[PDB]
Symmetry: D2
Subunit: 126 residues, 4 copies
């Protein structure tokens, strides 16, 4: 898997003393960005071409909480890649333990229209 | 449905010029809270008993974006209610149009253990 | 003063069990947006005139915390209005107690350049 | 100065295409946490000693914007250290340009009461 390792910041918690559920999606976005950066085609360069990566749906299942200052890892895997869309899966680990699992499906946009994924992008995703 | 009506704030947008996907989960939480408040058993009073409502999983599908200052409505429906858990469904409307759909499943916790849903809570959920 | 009323949402808290200090600036932004809307000249209309209101500096003094589900008011007052800038002050009240005080200073841009505040905009600020 | 390095995440931007002003206070919090960790006395350890660091006031002056994917540094400096309070200042640099300047003032509590800053804590702040 591609691994993104991250520490919980205080502002990411809520009054329950855990990381708020909505912030997991932010962590997944950070992981996707580092995935692309690490492969040498950062999302920022995609945006310079006039490409947008559009989120279609997202799912997260929450098994155990994350606390302030916990070190955790998001292990990302490409699940599906078609002409128009791609799907990532994510497992969030803390110590030995899967603390959450998720997935996100995406498509791509240029000049206000859905475009098939450029071969240059297929290369880094694959 | 229970209806929650809300306007998009500037800080809820990102550089794509849309509401960031993670904020939809925050909007659903606001809707759940107003649902309970409106039925006269706000979540805050549940927390005073020493009850926690725990999110198990969440899903959102994104059909059309929301923009800064858009007025939108979250229409909430109780989908499932068992001894231990409950599931809400959500449709986000803007003007005539379903802009996203979602669901969240929850359970309840007291004194570090999963508890069956108190009859008082069943009453307001139903 | 212009009065903006608001309830604290659960995601606005952190593990300290209080509203995270950064969110106060979001509440002030909401208050400014409601003030401009009340005047019949929402910020969205300004954006449709190729204008941006740019924040110069911000300060907040935190006296007492806000907790999840607290109802509070933000009292907004214009402090300064000049050719190019304006300054608002804010007092956040909970029940009849001042819980925080703040101020923000702003200017306006068009075409990536600083413009004199349009006369139509001075009219609603004053 | 203590140097904290950071990259802008997409969710930290707003529709203006810049980092929302409220997020700067989150970056400063991250910088403080890294400073304390570097000293072998993370804030999490303080929490395990029934202590809380409470923010008194905060100020930020915004000179130039940060954009999505910008790498920047926060230079943290202790400005004041007294029996009960301490003050940090911050300069945010992008490339070699100061983009923002700020400061935060803090005190410490235990049992819901203000305590003198422990000697062990003064030792790592100084």
């Amino acid at each position: 898997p591609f691994i993104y390792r991250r520490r919980v910041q205080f502002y990411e918690t809520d009054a329950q003393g855990i990381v708020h559920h909505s912030n997991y999606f932010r962590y997944f976005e950070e992981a996707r960005g580092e995935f692309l950066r690490s492969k040498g085609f950062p999302y920022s360069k995609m945006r310079d071409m006039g490409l947008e990566v559009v989120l279609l749906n997202a799912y997260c299942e929450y098994k155990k909480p994350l606390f302030y200052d916990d070190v955790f890892e998001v292990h990302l895997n490409l699940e599906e890649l078609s002409r128009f869309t791609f799907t990532f899966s994510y497992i969030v680990f803390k110590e030995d333990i899967a603390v959450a699992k998720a997935n996100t499906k995406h498509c791509m946009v240029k000049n206000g229209k859905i475009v098939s994924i450029p071969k240059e992008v297929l290369e880094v995703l694959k």
